[PDB]
Design an enzyme around this catalytic site. Sequence first.
Site, PDB file in Angstrom:
ATOM      1  N   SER A  92     -19.830  15.222  37.020  1.00  0.00           N
ATOM      2  CA  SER A  92     -19.174  14.529  35.971  1.00  0.00           C
ATOM      3  C   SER A  92     -17.718  14.830  36.030  1.00  0.00           C
ATOM      4  O   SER A  92     -17.313  14.506  36.861  1.00  0.00           O
ATOM      5  CB  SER A  92     -19.954  14.973  34.821  1.00  0.00           C
ATOM      6  OG  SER A  92     -19.588  14.510  33.341  1.00  0.00           O
ATOM      7  N   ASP A 214     -26.480   4.678  33.879  1.00  0.00           N
ATOM      8  CA  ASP A 214     -25.759   6.046  33.075  1.00  0.00           C
ATOM      9  C   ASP A 214     -25.052   5.488  31.714  1.00  0.00           C
ATOM     10  O   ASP A 214     -24.068   4.537  31.967  1.00  0.00           O
ATOM     11  CB  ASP A 214     -25.028   6.357  34.251  1.00  0.00           C
ATOM     12  CG  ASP A 214     -24.164   8.052  33.780  1.00  0.00           C
ATOM     13  OD1 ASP A 214     -24.435   8.427  32.534  1.00  0.00           O
ATOM     14  OD2 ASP A 214     -23.845   8.715  34.636  1.00  0.00           O
ATOM     15  N   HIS A 243     -27.154  11.072  32.933  1.00  0.00           N
ATOM     16  CA  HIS A 243     -25.655  11.364  33.531  1.00  0.00           C
ATOM     17  C   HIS A 243     -25.979  12.719  34.080  1.00  0.00           C
ATOM     18  O   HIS A 243     -24.974  13.167  34.707  1.00  0.00           O
ATOM     19  CB  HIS A 243     -24.836  11.752  32.281  1.00  0.00           C
ATOM     20  CG  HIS A 243     -23.405  11.837  32.734  1.00  0.00           C
ATOM     21  ND1 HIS A 243     -22.445  10.819  32.691  1.00  0.00           N
ATOM     22  CD2 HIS A 243     -22.701  12.951  32.725  1.00  0.00           C
ATOM     23  CE1 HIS A 243     -21.322  11.181  33.047  1.00  0.00           C
ATOM     24  NE2 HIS A 243     -21.325  12.666  33.341  1.00  0.00           N
TER      25      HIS A 243
END
Length: 263
Positions: A92, A214, A243
Amino acid sequence: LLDAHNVRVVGMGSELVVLGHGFGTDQSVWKHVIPHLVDDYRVILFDNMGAGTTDPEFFSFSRYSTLHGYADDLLSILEELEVESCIYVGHSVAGMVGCLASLERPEIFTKIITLSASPRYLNDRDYFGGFEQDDLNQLFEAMQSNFKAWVSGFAPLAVGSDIDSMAVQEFGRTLFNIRPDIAFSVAKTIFQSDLRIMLPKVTVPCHILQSSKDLAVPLVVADYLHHALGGPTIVEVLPTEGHLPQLSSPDIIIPVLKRHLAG
């Protein structure tokens, strides 16, 4: 430091690999992946400042108003550990944080692997990031109206999967454990960031790993980073939803991440 970021270095392998985590979790997001890296790699783990496993005495609201604060921490950890050269795996925002750190010391990173990373969540002219600013405002108001009810609805959408799934329940615990003003400020630093201008100056090779479904990162963002990163890149779309696919689908991520670590 080191103790301040809960740095753990396990493994006996030849190659150094640093594992970073994204918003709402900590280094335990890699708990299913670590045992498959120790034989071939020397794994370095750390917690981002502000995480639930972290002392709020060290969190500065000014230092982490930009992602430079997270990048300086990463570079400071690698300095203390006397890291000459390593592979950096960033989940991320940590994937973008690793790219930001490679701008200051490109010789430290032989390779960057990003998992579910996005340079900007905000839409823009000729850029599909996924979110409008009114989507951000509602998420920032709901996060401040009832923080616990926001966590209850954000975790199943972030991880994907069922509300009774173990991964969703564990991400909700770690996200709930962030202090609400710290969670509110870090979420503003992350969801309003824009690192599209730094991408072409990145000269480190990047392996762009992405889940097919996602909600925080559209599939076209992986292609944007493919053309806009200034170093050699490759994209691999994972047959997973969510995610945090290293948490909720580790058996798919382990072989793919392992093949990109050695290629």
